[PDB]
Design an enzyme around this catalytic site. Structure first.
Site, PDB file in Angstrom:
ATOM      1  N   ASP A 166       2.444  32.688   2.097  1.00  0.00           N
ATOM      2  CA  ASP A 166       2.815  33.781   1.214  1.00  0.00           C
ATOM      3  C   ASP A 166       3.190  33.068  -0.099  1.00  0.00           C
ATOM      4  OD1 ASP A 166       3.987  35.873  -0.253  1.00  0.00           O
ATOM      5  OD2 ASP A 166       5.760  36.019   1.062  1.00  0.00           O
ATOM      6  N   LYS A 184       2.797  33.448 -11.217  1.00  0.00           N
ATOM      7  CA  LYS A 184       2.090  34.545 -10.562  1.00  0.00           C
ATOM      8  C   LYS A 184       1.837  35.726 -11.501  1.00  0.00           C
ATOM      9  CE  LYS A 184       1.950  37.021  -6.231  1.00  0.00           C
ATOM     10  NZ  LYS A 184       2.623  37.208  -4.909  1.00  0.00           N
ATOM     11  N   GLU A 236      -1.031  41.027   0.636  1.00  0.00           N
ATOM     12  CA  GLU A 236       0.358  40.913   1.112  1.00  0.00           C
ATOM     13  C   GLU A 236       0.774  42.108   1.992  1.00  0.00           C
ATOM     14  OE1 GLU A 236       2.526  40.158  -2.562  1.00  0.00           O
ATOM     15  OE2 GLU A 236       1.421  38.271  -2.735  1.00  0.00           O
ATOM     16  N   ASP A 264       7.673  46.964  -0.530  1.00  0.00           N
ATOM     17  CA  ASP A 264       7.924  45.531  -0.772  1.00  0.00           C
ATOM     18  C   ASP A 264       8.797  45.288  -1.987  1.00  0.00           C
ATOM     19  OD1 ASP A 264       7.716  42.727  -1.403  1.00  0.00           O
ATOM     20  OD2 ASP A 264       5.525  42.632  -1.090  1.00  0.00           O
TER      21      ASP A 264
END
Ligand SMILES: Nc1ncnc2c1nc(N)n2[C@@H]1O[C@H](CO)[C@@H](O)[C@H]1O
Length: 382
Positions: free
Chosen positions: A9, A71, A176, A199
């Site tokens: 992850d 990211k 994800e 999330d």
């Protein structure tokens, strides 16, 4: 020969690595004893490259040369309006190079170097690879790497490229929210099911509506808030104590950067404690101008400080249901992802939104995505 394939992850703020060993998923602790590694890179003035906990637990003394949130930039062009907005909030330099937002840092003694966002992510991936290799006692060459469901072609290729630089053959790029669902065994269910993945990470909030049919996942709709996460909850508590300290002592804490880092560390620890305890105490010795700080925080005050932020999480959940032509009752499974989902008010808000429906439980929400990636990695290792 793929060897032992790892499940990674690769998160905005934290990364996690798992393997399938002796019939089960093993989440691997790093060299600092942590099951999650900050997606941070720091270049010290001596020229030492720090990755993970060492990089993050030094960020205050080196803000210019501490890289994080790569990211947000990976697989994007320099002139992308998202890039142009994000670099306003980043403390390190970002320059246009080969149409891309390259990170510019002093790697030691005034020597400047530029890195593509995938080169920074490759350093995070290298640290994850070393963590798994220390655990396995052997070299790792292949990986399953997760990405947000909204990641486009360039973002997915740049994540694979980060892997290549790190010496990892990224065999599968998986979403994800799909990895989280696999972690909960929602793949081996029967018939058509609608899965809501909520999330709430350290710096991002992602809501995904997935459909599972005959073991096949489809991402129907995505929403959330790219600038909402656990760190925002910390900042609200920071503001509350900085305000209170000025009221009590007449002093402005932010004049001392060393005093804000110390308060940040203790506020984060207090926040985590408030998920299980009803009050936490923040004590910091020689806080500001040699004076000590001693304050308490109740779960009620924390919730009050963050109520608007907590309540704001329900709006993207409503937008995904509309964009999927579904209603609340059509959701068969609720998956909570990210350490922030351990917040009791967040769990109440989700449960109450879905009129009392209990979410899936059992896997650490901060590890569910790497767990799912490791499940897939297990099949590929054979
Ligand atoms: N037990 C907990 N209670 C409240 N927040 C928690 C938490 N555990 C983590 N990791 N977090 C937060 O998750 C985010 C990413 O690690 C950070 O903001 C953590 O503080």
């Amino acid at each position: 020969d793929v060897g032992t394939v790892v499940g990674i992850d690769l998160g905005t703020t934290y990364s996690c690595v798992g393997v399938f060993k002796n019939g089960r998923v093993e989440i691997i602790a790093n060299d600092q004893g942590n099951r999650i590694t900050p997606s941070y890179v720091a270049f010290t003035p001596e020229g030492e490259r720090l990755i993970g906990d060492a990089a993050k637990n030094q960020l205050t003394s080196n803000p210019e040369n501490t890289v994080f949130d790569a990211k947000r930039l990976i697989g994007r062009t320099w002139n992308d309006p998202s890039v142009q907005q994000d670099i306003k909030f980043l403390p390190f330099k970002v320059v246009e190079k080969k149409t891309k937002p390259y990170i510019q840092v002093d790697i030691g003694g005034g020597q400047t170097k530029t890195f593509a966002p995938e080169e920074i992510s490759a350093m995070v991936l290298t640290k994850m690879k070393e963590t798994a290799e220390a655990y396995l006692g052997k070299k790792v060459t292949h990986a399953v790497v997760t990405v947000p469901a909204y990641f486009n072609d360039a973002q997915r290729q740049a994540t694979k490229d980060a892997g290549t630089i790190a010496g990892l053959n990224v065999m599968r790029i998986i979403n994800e929210p799909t990895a989280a669902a696999i972690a909960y065994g929602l793949d081996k269910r029967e018939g058509e099911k609608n899965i809501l993945v909520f999330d709430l990470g350290g710096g991002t909030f992602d809501v995904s509506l997935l459909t599972i049919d005959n073991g096949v996942f489809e991402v129907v709709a995505t929403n959330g808030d790219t600038h909402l996460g656990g760190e925002d909850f910390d900042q609200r508590v920071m503001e509350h104590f900085i305000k209170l300290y000025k009221k009590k002592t007449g002093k402005d804490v932010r004049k001392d950067n060393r005093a804000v880092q110390k308060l940040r560390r203790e506020v984060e620890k207090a926040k985590r404690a408030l998920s299980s305890q009803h009050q936490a105490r923040i004590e910091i010795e020689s806080f500001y101008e040699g004076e000590d700080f001693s304050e308490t925080l109740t779960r009620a005050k924390f919730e009050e400080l963050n109520m608007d932020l907590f309540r704001s999480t329900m709006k993207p959940v409503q937008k995904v249901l509309e964009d999927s032509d579904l209603k609340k009752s059509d959701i068969d499974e609720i998956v909570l992802v990210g350490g922030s989902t351990r917040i009791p008010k967040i769990q109440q808000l989700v449960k109450e939104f879905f009129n009392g429906k209990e979410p899936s439980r059992g896997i650490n929400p901060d590890e569910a995505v790497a767990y799912g990636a490791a499940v897939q990695a297990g099949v590929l290792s054979g």
